[PDB]
From a paper:
The coordinated action of multiple replicative helicase loading factors is needed for the licensing of replication origins prior to DNA replication. Binding of the Origin Recognition Complex (ORC) to DNA initiates the ATP-dependent recruitment of Cdc6, Cdt1 and Mcm2-7 loading, but the structural details for timely ATPase site regulation and for how loading can be impeded by inhibitory signals, such as cyclin-dependent kinase phosphorylation, are unknown. Apart from Cdt1 and Orc6 (a subunit of ORC), all loading factors belong to the superfamily of ATPases Associated with various cellular Activities (AAA+). Here, we report cryo-EM structures of ARS1-bound S. cerevisiae (Sc) ORC and of the ternary complex with Cdc6 at sub-3 Å resolutions.
In our cryo-EM structure of the ternary complex, Cdc6 is seen to complete the ORC ring as expected by binding in between Orc1 and Orc2. Surprisingly, masked classification of the Cdc6 region revealed that the ORC·Cdc6 ring adopts two distinct conformations that differ in pitch and the positioning of Cdc6. The two states arise from a rocking motion of mainly Orc1 and Cdc6, which leads to ring flattening as the complex transitions from state 1 to state 2 (referred to as ODC1 and ODC2 hereafter). Both states also differ from the ring conformation seen in a loading intermediate containing DNA, ORC, Cdc6, Cdt1, and Mcm2-7 (OCCM), indicating this change in ring conformation may be linked to the functional ORC·Cdc6 cycle during Mcm2-7 loading. One possibility is that Cdc6 binding drives ScORC into a hydrolysis-competent conformation; however, inspection of the Orc1·Orc4 ATPase site configuration in our 2.5 and 2.7 Å cryo-EM structures of ODC1 and ODC2 reveals that the active site waters remain in a non-lytic position. The Orc1-sensor 1 is also flipped away from ATP in ODC1, although it appears to move closer to ATP in ODC2. The second ATPase center in the ternary ScORC·DNA·Cdc6 complex at the interface between Orc1 and Cdc6 likewise appears to reside in a pre-hydrolysis state. Overall, the Cdc6·Orc1 sites in ODC1 and ODC2 are configured very similarly to each other and to that of Orc1 and Orc4, but the Cdc6-sensor 1 (N263), which is important for budding yeast viability and ATP hydrolysis by Cdc648,58,59, points into the active site and bonds with the γ-phosphate. A water molecule positioned for an in-line nucleophilic attack, however, is not seen. Intriguingly, Cdc6 binding to ScORC causes conformational rearrangements in the B-loop of Orc1 that help reorient the Orc1 arginine finger helix (with arginine finger R616) for completion of the Cdc6 ATPase site.
Numbering used by the authors:
A (entry chain F): 271 to 427
B (entry chain E): 214 to 222, 229 to 299, 323 to 396, 407 to 478
C (entry chain C): 16 to 30, 38 to 93, 100 to 158, 179 to 370, 385 to 501, 510 to 616
D (entry chain D): 424 to 425, 447 to 529
E (entry chain B): 235 to 343, 356 to 497
The structure:
Amino acid sequence: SLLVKKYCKMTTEEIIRLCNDFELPREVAYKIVDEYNINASRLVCPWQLVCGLVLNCTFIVFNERRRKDPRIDHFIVSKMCSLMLTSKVDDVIECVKLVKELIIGEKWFRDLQIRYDDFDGIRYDEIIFRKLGSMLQTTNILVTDDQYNIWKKRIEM
Amino acid sequence: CLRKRIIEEDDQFQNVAANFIHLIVQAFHSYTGNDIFALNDLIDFKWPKYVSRITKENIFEPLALYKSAIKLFLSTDDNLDLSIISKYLLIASYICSYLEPRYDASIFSRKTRIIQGRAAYGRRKKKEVNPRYLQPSLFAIERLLAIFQAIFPIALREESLMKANIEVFQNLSELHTLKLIATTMNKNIDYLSPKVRWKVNVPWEIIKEISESVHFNISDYFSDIH
Amino acid sequence: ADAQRSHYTVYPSLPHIPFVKLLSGKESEVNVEKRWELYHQLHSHFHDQVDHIIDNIEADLKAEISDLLYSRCFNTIFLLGSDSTTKIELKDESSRYNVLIELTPKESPNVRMMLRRSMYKLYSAADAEENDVSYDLSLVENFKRLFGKDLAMVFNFKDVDSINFNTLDNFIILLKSAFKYDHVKISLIFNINTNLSNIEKNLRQSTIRLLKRNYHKLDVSSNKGFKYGNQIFQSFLDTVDGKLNLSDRFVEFILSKMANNTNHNLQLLTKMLDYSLMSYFFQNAFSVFIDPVNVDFLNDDYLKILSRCPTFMFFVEGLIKQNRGLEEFFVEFLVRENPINGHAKFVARFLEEELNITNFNLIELYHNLLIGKLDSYLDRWSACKEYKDRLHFEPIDTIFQELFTLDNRSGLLTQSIFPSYKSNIEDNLLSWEQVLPSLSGDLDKIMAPVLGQLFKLYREANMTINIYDFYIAFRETLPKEEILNFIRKDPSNTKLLELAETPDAFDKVALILFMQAIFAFENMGLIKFQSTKSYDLVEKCVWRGI
Amino acid sequence: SRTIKLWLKKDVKNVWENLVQLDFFTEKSAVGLRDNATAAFYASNYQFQGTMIPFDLRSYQMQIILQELRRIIPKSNMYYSWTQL
Amino acid sequence: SASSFLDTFEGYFDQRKIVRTNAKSRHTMSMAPDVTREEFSLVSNFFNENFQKRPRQKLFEIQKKMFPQYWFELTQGFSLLFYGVGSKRNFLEEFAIDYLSPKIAYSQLNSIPCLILNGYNPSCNYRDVFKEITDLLVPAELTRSETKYWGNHVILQIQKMIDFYKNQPLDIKLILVVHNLDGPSIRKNTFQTMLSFLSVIRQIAIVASTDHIYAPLLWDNMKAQNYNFVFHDISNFEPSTVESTFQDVMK
């Protein structure tokens, strides 16, 4: 496993290669890199921070494709369990929920969540009614309209 | 009871009652002292249970009657539904009252450190006197909520630790209402004042029985400190 | 000004149901009206049964208290788990007068007030049935001379776990002196909410030995043996039988919330059941089809919504593996009984009457019948082994049954009745873009609201904070040129322009915005000033998620 | 170690209450009987902190010290050696 | 903070470390700029009326669509408790005056009278509040038997009101708007007992607000049962200009 390794010498190009393995554009990848540099030391296992940062941005950037296909989540989790050479899927979840606590308040994470409309996996137009306690909020009980149209196309083909 | 027992199985009855009184005195004089009222109460509590052990073999043998009713003369026998959140809040308040807050990170901290940080070393020397013999110390609300969160029973979107919602605070308010926890002020209490500090108000046997009702090992938390 | 008064009454000038139009506002108003009327029939049919159950609770409590009360010492009764809200009535039996004296810890600051209030109550009742007196125990001594009747006093100590036990011990020892008067008998009722052992160690051992001479225990909690909550749950089952169904998540949430409340979980159970019924009749446009008269009012919007049903999804996917017709199918396939409630009632009356299994909760029985584990619930008693094949039931996963269901997936029940209040406050403080929309446009995007920035700097600081250093840390994040451009964008206000002309303008603006947020944080309870006349350091009182 | 029944803690409570009632122990810093009825009435409307805590944590002080106990307990008494320190 | 954890009990224990004496800064307000009361007020109202006013107005327009749900909760006997970050004063006045009283008055056929308590005022007193409640509702006076023996006449009067109004038709006669139910004089136990016992009555609508993070510590099982709250988070980051003038700000 790469999450047990302590005090590793990370070049600046390995993080860009790991970000390009998850199709992150240049701004978010450079922000992950800069987030690594300002906490370069004070670090125990760099791979845990980089892995949590990359997957935390991955669920934000690709949140449109994660609502349509729930398999994408397992798929990306497994690519990660791989690039970290680990067979335990709870270590990756521990990594992302430990990195989320260090990134939940910054300005750039705020800009990313605003621009891709992520807000812990929710649109703003739903989360304002979850926070208000609306009776008329959208319930995850009925199928999505576009998902139902996609299924109707799948049975038409 | 004696008059129904003698038909179910005067001077002899007088000797039976007098021998019972003398046995009661010799069993419980150290417990009662020279107290007529307490010994009268013990005689009233133990006379029918002594009469029920009287058989045809036991009347003329006071020794055989004494061994027939030995358990009456060995112990005094003068005696007469809380929520899970309330029980764990009482346990956490007992811990907060009887453990110093400088060492809490050396008992409860279990998280993985992304950031380089040194946990607490722990206490060096044991105490000489058991601190549960003394009066409890006072604590703040957030310390009690910290220890309650650390000791309460339990993935990408779960966050399995229980946070302090309104049911926890309602249980804490009821616990103050029942005087199982107490404050520095007794009347006209500003609950929301930061100056107001809280202490446990139960003895160790009560918190022991409470911890035995929820299978929590509270004696493990005080074994290493004195 | 009305904003500066303590209180004021407003009679506002004025110039029809709270239900709104569903279906994206394409619902008709008459369907809104019959939604309202159907909600009221269900609510009334539930609450009439609930009121009858509550009256039965107080009736059997009165009967058990009177039976334990009337069938040279005290007659002591310990009501364990009592909220002290029971109205005790004594009998009317001739040649003797029976007085109930109720005493509260507020009415008991010392023994003298206890005796004075008790004797005033005694003399008031004895005068009210058929010359002034001294309100002490000699009135108990002279009661047969002054009234011609024997005396039976019943003392009801309300909320014993709040009283001073030294005062109560001295009052009981004082009441012991009335035993020699030959016409007086005294009953004591203690409403205990913790445990008998707690009140044992708070009293003297001689007082315990006095109370032990004649005492009984009577346990009446809100769910003593689950018998009264089972009636409320069964009446809710009957009011939605053949009409609505319960998910296992909702029953699981109900069991979890009733586990967290000790004395008042019956009203809590009724509260979440009524709030779920409210949420359904406010949310679902298909609730008009609860009544089988309204099925002819179908539309294209109704058929479009009901097509997105996972059970109907699996049904048509199985059909393709193996509108008018859809309308007839929807009409025909909502008729059936859904016999889970009848089977639950049958299992309940079979266990209660035949096997004499009485310490069961109907809610977990219904949960196990919902998840198909009624044998796994029944095999904990080792008495229905011969009837495991008799009471076997498996649910039928009927199609579009989630259009008529009470289910907890959105967390609306969690947000409304049991919110994570402190965590919601901290989450809104830390992540304010989930509160405020992302629409002086330049400043609103580049600089956060001051409370949120203050909480972000608050969270990452130590337990003790120097507020000058805290104010410098707050000042380094704010943009200087954009703030100075925003403050000069009001040309009508000349004092603002004059203050913006000063070279120390940004430090003053930062200090003003910092001090307003610091006093907001102090009022909310987040920070605590150390000394009264220093005001230089603060302590954090609040950490997020704990 | 060098046989007396060892009484349990639940039975020593009665002995402790008897010792308090016989004026051997006094509650710590207790005023006791007030000089006049006005101070006594003022004291009767206040709940003291000793009466709201459990009985095993109440602070007491002796009316008779160990040196006096050594002075008046006979030498033949079998608890005499513990009046020394 | 030189810490590894921020949130949860881990952050609580990790951020409360023994900082050394030499590490502590000695900075005070003597190195801070001096401001007057008037420029403080001027910058205060300018920022309150121009910084993020448009998102606050949009969000306030969003929360106004929940007013029929609030009215529906009030018709079933629940008391509304509004909490959040920012002032809820204008929200509670606008909901209870512009919306709730005319809707209730039209639904049971003058408008329903609204009594507004200001719990941010330290001089909010429960005896005068019950005097105006008595003036608005005209309850029957206690008899001599009901007065007990130096009993509290307010609480006994409300208990008489409770077992009187149990038989009346369920028509809302009074709206009780309590601003800052957690404020300095209202949070005391006698006032909370008074208001929870008034919340028992079906014919009084209770709309309340809280500001302290520890406000649910005020209510035990009896008080939470009598209050019968439905909670609503209406965080808006409102500046709280009215409530700030009841504390000494410039110190």
